[PDB]
Symmetry: C3
Subunit: 114 residues, 3 copies
């Protein structure tokens, strides 16, 4: 089973696949802890109710998007290490439609190289 | 076997992996029907013969790209639900080189979460 | 085991998963040879010490990125054929921080279609 997690803004809550062992753990405030070194794909959709969103790793800004219409794919593909904290933040949540705003992550491959 | 489908503009035709059960079904007019809830990656290449292309889900515009050179990767990563209809349309097909224009989709993960 | 390869700029060296048979082979000058037809995802990070980077397939420019801050995800998703040579080049390596600059590739699916 793949390792996938999805955070819904309407519920403010994480759901994840039942894959064992977990590759991620849900945290409060919409954060996620990476448990395994790996290559991960982050996806997501942000619908407006222009707004701006920021994807972050620990302190680092992975990306900043600004749009006056729905962003149907935020994120990208990143190597993360065990302990990395991933977060998606909004300039103002009053500008987004929570019912149709969510983000998520899937493990593509562990990093057992040469 | 992964679930993958690819549409070629030269043949106007879909080809797909032999994976059972199917996760997608080919439709006329270059459309595709999603059969399973899931996280999908859409890819593709559009070569010019500036042109514009639009990726759509049902009524929704997923993305619009405009370029005067080859776009080597259209698309992105999206959650789709069973019944969603995906389409890639061109502002004018006379502006593209069909022999080197194609698009496609692969299932990354079904959505069996928490 | 997935087929994954990663090139580090600090070592100027490729590392790869032990997956058999290989889907790629490392080459000198930071190049990579595709051994199997397939859909591949290219990722990478380029940190500055504005700089520009170019991802190439054989002669073809897949993409050109320019930034004055870290690019946390270069690349995208592409069909490659056996024999394709992939390369990532810099306008000037004196503008990048090699310790935190790397790029890589993972095989998503072989191309056994209809």
């Amino acid at each position: 089973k793949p390792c996938l997690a999805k955070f819904e803004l309407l519920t403010s809550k994480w759901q994840m696949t039942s894959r064992k062992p977990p590759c991620v753990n849900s945290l409060p405030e919409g954060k996620l802890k990476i448990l395994q070194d790996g290559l991960y794909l982050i996806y997501g959709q942000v619908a407006p109710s222009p707004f701006a969103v920021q994807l972050r790793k620990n302190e680092a800004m992975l990306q900043t998007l600004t749009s006056n219409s729905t962003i149907y794919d935020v994120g990208g593909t990143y190597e993360f290490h065990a302990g990395d904290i991933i977060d998606l933040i909004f300039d103002d949540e009053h500008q987004v439609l929570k019912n149709n705003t969510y983000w998520g992550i899937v493990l593509l491959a562990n990093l057992f190289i040469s």
